Design a protein around this ligand. Sequence first.
Ligand SMILES: *[C@@H]1O[C@H](CO)[C@@H](O[C@@H]2O[C@H](CO)[C@@H](O[C@@H]3O[C@H](CO[C@H]4O[C@H](CO)[C@@H](O)[C@H](O)[C@@H]4O[C@@H]4O[C@H](CO)[C@@H](O)[C@H](O)[C@H]4NC(C)=O)[C@@H](O)[C@H](O[C@H]4O[C@H](CO)[C@@H](O)[C@H](O)[C@@H]4O[C@@H]4O[C@H](CO)[C@@H](O)[C@H](O)[C@H]4NC(C)=O)[C@@H]3O)[C@H](O)[C@H]2NC(C)=O)[C@H](O)[C@H]1NC(C)=O
Lengths: 208, 147
Amino acid sequence: GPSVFLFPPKPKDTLYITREPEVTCVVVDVSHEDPEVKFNWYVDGVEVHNAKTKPREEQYNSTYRVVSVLTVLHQDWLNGKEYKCKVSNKALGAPIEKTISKAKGQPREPQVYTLPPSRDELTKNQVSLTCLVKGFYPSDIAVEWESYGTEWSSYKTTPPVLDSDGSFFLYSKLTVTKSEWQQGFVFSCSVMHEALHNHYTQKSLSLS
Amino acid sequence: PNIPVQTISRAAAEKLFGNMEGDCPSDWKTDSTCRMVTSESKNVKLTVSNDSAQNSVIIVDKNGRLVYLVENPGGYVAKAATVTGKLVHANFGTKKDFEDLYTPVNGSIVIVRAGKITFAEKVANAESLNAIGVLIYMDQTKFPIVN
Ligand SMILES: *[C@@H]1O[C@H](CO)[C@@H](O[C@@H]2O[C@H](CO)[C@@H](O[C@@H]3O[C@H](CO[C@H]4O[C@H](CO)[C@@H](O)[C@H](O)[C@@H]4O[C@@H]4O[C@H](CO)[C@@H](O)[C@H](O)[C@H]4NC(C)=O)[C@@H](O)[C@H](O[C@H]4O[C@H](CO)[C@@H](O)[C@H](O)[C@@H]4O[C@@H]4O[C@H](CO)[C@@H](O)[C@H](O)[C@H]4NC(C)=O)[C@@H]3O)[C@H](O)[C@H]2NC(C)=O)[C@H](O)[C@H]1NC(C)=O
């Protein structure tokens, strides 16, 4: 049987009015016998027809992957409207409903702190620069590392983790060659969050 | 001079060579470490800014993403611009060096040794072949300009 996965829009897309945020309804398994998929979109229970179905595409495991994309309004998403995706198939016993929305709470501003490498980590040819982003709500957040106005390729970010106070935190780890760190270059952690002034803050870090 | 030109240290050059492929002609009596062109997967990005503080030479991902900070040149050559491309060695950037050159300069950043001819000439020769930027380094061995 088909399986349905509803995804939220990218934080930056929802935060920046210059950008276009959209919800993605993904259909993972589509039968060869019954390829037909009907998509029905709903916003706060009201059906809309603004969405576009991407072309169906055969995967490496003889299963079609149908995706439907619905563009959402920035403040509709930020206010906490629910988006329901209804998938109908003859291969389905009943049509599948998935719902996503923004977490409805008081926004809390993220605290952003950068940490330098451990003295023990300088033994290695490569070192990690750490970016602690904590005490934020909701979970919606965008984190980039950069140097001299250029984004860093070599960095990875843990998913948000629920803290004890109902807030979220996470870590971002930029990996650089040690020599680049020792030469006193500046690395910056960029953080976008709705609670921030201009949905943006930046923390820099370098050799003392 | 519609293209940026920038001076780099011998160290920054060698770091750039570290990310290049090809061996130099025996004819240029260079070091072992010298290389001709950047590997497919990397390009250099050069930024010359009204703030000479934030000049930068960086090696970039096909995605324009950062791989290596190579330098922040303190000096300047007497165009403020940011350019991304392949880096190609052209020795002294003589018209001759250029005409002998295996890899074509068009659309690429050029790196040359300070040497036989003026900076002004090197830039013009390169600009003449549609290079998008010029790096210049001093190897210790010295080749006084003739006039
Ligand atoms: C044939 O081959 C296909 C490809 O290899 C394959 O398709 C795959 O099908 C599986 C199911 O078998 C499906 O699994 C789910 O994936 C969810 C996340 O997918 C993300 O990340 C993956 C990994 O990189 C990407 O491949 C996906 O495209 C998607 O990436 C995101 O895509 C969106 C839009 O494209 C972008 O906007 C994002 O930026 C992008 N991310 C990235 C990385 O680029 C995953 O979350 C699912 O986990 C949840 O459900 C599971 C139950 O199935 C639970 O085990 C698990 O706990 C999770 O539960 C959820 O928990 C959440 C916590 O907040 C709650 O919010 C949810 O309520 C709760 N939901 C549910 C329903 O439990 C899960 O792993 C694959 O994604 C899909 N695609 C790929 C590439 O694998 C076919 O299935 C293959 N055939 C066969 C025989 O399997």
